[PDB]
Structure 1
Amino acid sequence: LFPPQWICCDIRYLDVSILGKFAVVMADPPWDIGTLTDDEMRRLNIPVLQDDGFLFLWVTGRAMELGRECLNLWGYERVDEIIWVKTNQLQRIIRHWLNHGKEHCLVGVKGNPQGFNQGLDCDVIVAEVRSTSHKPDEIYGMIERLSPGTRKIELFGRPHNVQPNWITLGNQLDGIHLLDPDVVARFKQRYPDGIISK
């Protein structure tokens, strides 16, 4: 259901089967380059979140390789790689061996998605650094034009990430805010006392 929804939770322990299926998954995970170990990242129950659709996965450093590993382990094929060129308010680049002017977002596909608007946007984003750790808001527009009106889910999102058509998961969100009747019903059953442990 259209308006933003979110679950404050530990993504390692939430039973995500209650959430249903999504046209798009996005994650800006805390790779161990509070972080998650490689094994914890590998063990995330991504496979149950989609049958046919796309994954957007931010990577940096050795997670350029580890994120590819997770991607394939979760059942995705990497079919694009978005590059975010980091600028200031005057559109100049924010300048080990080389200075880094960009961040990478791997794009995975699972199944055979039908009815997506592939090819409308290009794979370079030019956008201003806001806070440290934030990713540009432009990615939501790209994803919306790609798959308009469909259900989407973000993992490790923060309050600024909540968006219409998105369910946002993360341990820095404020409580639980669910409005999709299917999801509310399955959440009550799975978590009658509202507690997400173990």
Structure 2
Amino acid sequence: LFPPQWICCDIRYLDVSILGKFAVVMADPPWDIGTLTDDEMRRLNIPVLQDDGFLFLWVTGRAMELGRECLNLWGYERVDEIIWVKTNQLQRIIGHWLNHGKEHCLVGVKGNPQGFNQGLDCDVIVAEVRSTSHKPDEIYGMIERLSPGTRKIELFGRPHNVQPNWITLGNQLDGIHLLDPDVVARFKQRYPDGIISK
């Protein structure tokens, strides 16, 4: 079901097997650099979320390496790396050896995705910084052109991240808003009293 959907939840504890399969997964984890430990990150049940598709994993600092470990452990091969060059409103550019002008987003592939529009966009985003840790909205457009109309899931998103065709998960969302009937049915069955515990 096309319009935005979300679940306020602790992503460590949600049973994500109720959500179905997704063409694209994107995650912006609170790396331990309300964080998750390296082990909690490794243990996320990402493998059940896709059979064939792409994962977008934001990384910084030592999560450039830890995120590669997670990507591979979850069953993905890293096949691209987007960098977002951070600018102000005048398109000027805004780790203790160099100043940092960019954020990195790893691109992993699982299975053999068919029917995606690879090579439409390039791997550099030039876009303005907004609030702290707010990712650029350009990534949703790149992802929609890559895989138009398909179901997508975002992990560790915030209210401003909800988007049509996306289900957003995070612990600062407002409640649970689910419209896809298959998801609603499996959610009621798994969580008949609406609570998500352990």
SS in 2 for 1:93: coil
Corresponding position of 1:126: 126
Mapped to 2, the partners of 1:28 and 1:51 lie a distance apart of 21
Q: Residue deviations 1:128-186, cap 9 Å, x none?
A: 00111100000000000000000000000000000000000000000000000000000
2:23 maps to which residue?
A: 23
Quick one: distance in 1 between partners of 2:104 and 2:52? 23
Partner Cα separation in structure 2 for residue 50 and residue 105 of structure 1: 19
Q: CA deviation at 1:34?
A: 1.1
User: Which string of whole-angstrom CA distances, capped at 9 and with x for unpartnered residues, describes residues 32-82 of structure 1?
Assistant: 011000000000000000000000000000000000000000000000000
Q: How many residues align?
A: 198
- Secondary structure of the residue that 1:68 maps to in structure 2? helix
Give SS of 1:65's match.
helix
- Deviation (angstroms), 1:95: 13
The runs of at least 4 aligned residues of structure 1 exceeding 3 Å deviation read: none
Which residue of the partner structure matches residue 71 of structure 1? 71
Would you say the 8 A contact 2:150–2:165 is kept in 1? yes
User: Unmatched 5+ residue regions in structure 1?
Assistant: none
Q: Contact conserved, 2:53 with 2:111, CA < 8 A, in 1? A: yes
TM-score of the superposed pair, with normalisation by structure 1: 0.99
- Check 1:108–1:13 CA distance in 2 against 1; reply closer, same or farther (3 A cut): same
The DSSP-based 3-state class of the residue aligned with 1:112 is: coil
Would the aligned equivalents of 1:31 and 1:37 in 2 still touch at CA under 8 Å? yes
Is contact 2:61–2:95 with CA below 8 Å preserved after alignment? no
Give the SS at the match of 2:51: coil
Question: Cα distance, 1:21 vs. partner?
Answer: 0.0
- Residue 150 of structure 1: aligned partner: 150
Residue deviations 1:80-129, cap 9 Å, x none? 00000000000000090000000000000000000000000000000000
Distance 1:188 1:162 in 2: 22
| TM-score after normalising by structure 2 | 0.99
1:95 aligns with 2:120: no
Aligned with 1:21: secondary structure? coil
SS in 1 for 2:6: strand
Cα distance in 1 for residues equivalent to 2:34 and 2:191: 25
Overall identity of the aligned pairs, in % = 99
SS across alignment from 1:157: coil
The separation in 1 between residues aligned to 2:95 and 2:56, in whole angstroms, is 25
1:60 is matched with 60
User: 1:6·1:167 contact (CA, 8 Å) conserved in 2?
Assistant: yes
Q: Distance in 1 between matches of 2:166 and 2:197?
A: 23
SS in 2 for 1:182: helix
List alignment gaps of at least 5 residues for structure 2.
Answer: none
Question: 1:95·1:101 contact (CA, 8 Å) conserved in 2?
Answer: no
